[PDB]
């Protein structure tokens, strides 16, 4: 159940395999990619180096072939991508999407529950 990642913006993110449907019930990687595409200027602007990993960890979640419980990113990955960029959308009449919320994300502190995070 691990298809190779085909979404262009999600190349070089640390992992190369994903599963569908994702949390947003996208049927194919074409459906999700058209929603991640909207962020590629935000990535190119580089308002947050964690924005790259955060989106892909949500739209193209990691598909470990050994391990079959969903691995989400930590809330810290979201809070850095948020506050690092969120002012940019806020200045120009856009808004941090409700899909990219950080509140209910698994914290890095909890030792039971995993969540991906680099630095």
């Amino acid at each position: 159940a691990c298809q190779e990642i085909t979404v262009p913006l999600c190349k070089g993110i640390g992992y190369q395999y994903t599963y569908m449907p994702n949390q947003f019930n996208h049927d194919t990687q074409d459906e999700a990619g058209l929603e991640v595409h909207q962020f590629w200027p935000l990535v190119e602007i580089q308002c947050s180096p964690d924005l790259k990993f955060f989106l892909c960890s949500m739209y193209t979640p990691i598909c470990l072939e050994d391990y079959k419980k969903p691995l989400p990113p930590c809330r810290s990955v979201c809070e850095r991508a948020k506050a690092g960029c969120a002012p940019l959308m806020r200045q120009y009449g856009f808004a941090w999407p409700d899909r990219m919320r950080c509140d209910r994300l698994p914290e890095q502190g909890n030792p039971d529950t995993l969540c991906m995070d680099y630095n």
């Epitope: 929603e35 909207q38 200027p41 308002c47 009449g93 808004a95 999407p97 409700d98």
Partner: antibody
Framework: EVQLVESGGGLVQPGGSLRLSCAAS????????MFWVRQAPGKGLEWVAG????????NYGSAVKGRATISRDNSKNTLYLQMNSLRAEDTAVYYC???????????????????WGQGTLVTVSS | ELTQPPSVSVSPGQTARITCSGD????????YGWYQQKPGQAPVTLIY???KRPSGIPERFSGSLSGSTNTLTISGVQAEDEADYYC?????????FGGGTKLTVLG
């Protein structure tokens, strides 16, 4: 096959009124945003009016605000543009322009121009 | 507030590159579109969402993004590619178009 036909173009006296109508086909009309873009003869494209899918949030350009009103009626697949107090600087070819693909169920998305009508010339002369 | 070169000259078979960018206040994370206007014809969109081709546009037209600058790339330029190429951008509040670029095919 996407088709956007603009009617109602012709002569309008200065300080007069204008009503344009764009008839859409080949696509689900109510599923895309809709814009008016004009081009004065020999000049560049200029942003005029824009509207959402249902018609709750009209958007207008600088040289147009307060004088124009964009609207749609998704029953007969028609877009409209009304204008008042037309000056000479309003003579232009007026284009009907369809929106491109948008990701559903998200509040973050950007507009694009997917299709253009053939345009109708509006001459502002006495 | 979109700027693009007034004119680009290329030889048949060569590759033309037209650049579009936003000024010191334009939405730096917004997308760029490209529309081709052949003489006397209505505009036709080649590129939307920075590097996407609508159905029917040939694949020799391509878009690329670098910072706040998009580049339209036309490979295998033929004399028929003579046209005005306008770029456009939207920040959800308004639209902004560039002055246009005239493509002349030399020779």
């Amino acid at each position: 096959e996407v088709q956007l036909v603009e009617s109602g173009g012709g002569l309008v006296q200065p300080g007069g009124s204008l009503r344009l109508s764009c008839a859409a086909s080949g696509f689900t009309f109510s599923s895309f945003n809709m814009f008016w873009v004009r081009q004065a003869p020999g000049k560049g494209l200029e942003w005029v009016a824009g509207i959402d899918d249902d018609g709750s949030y009209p958007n207008y350009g600088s040289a147009v605000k307060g004088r124009a009103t964009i609207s749609r009626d998704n029953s007969k697949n028609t877009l409209y543009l009304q204008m008042n107090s037309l000056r000479a600087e309003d003579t232009a070819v007026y284009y009907c322009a369809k929106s491109g693909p948008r990701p559903p169920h998200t509040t973050y998305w950007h507009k694009s121009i997917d299709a253009w009508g053939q345009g109708t010339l509006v001459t502002v002369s006495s | 507030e979109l700027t693009q070169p007034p004119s680009v000259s290329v030889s048949p078979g060569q590759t033309a590159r037209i650049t579009c960018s936003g000024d010191g206040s334009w939405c730096p994370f917004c997308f760029y579109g490209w529309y081709q206007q052949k003489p006397g014809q209505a505009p036709v969109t080649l590129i939307y969402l920075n590097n996407k081709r609508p159905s029917g546009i040939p694949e020799r037209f391509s878009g690329s993004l670098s910072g706040s600058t998009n580049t339209l790339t036309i490979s295998g330029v033929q004399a028929e590619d003579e046209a005005d190429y306008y770029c456009g951008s939207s920040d959800f509040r308004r639209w902004a178009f560039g002055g246009g670029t005239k493509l002349t095919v030399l020779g």
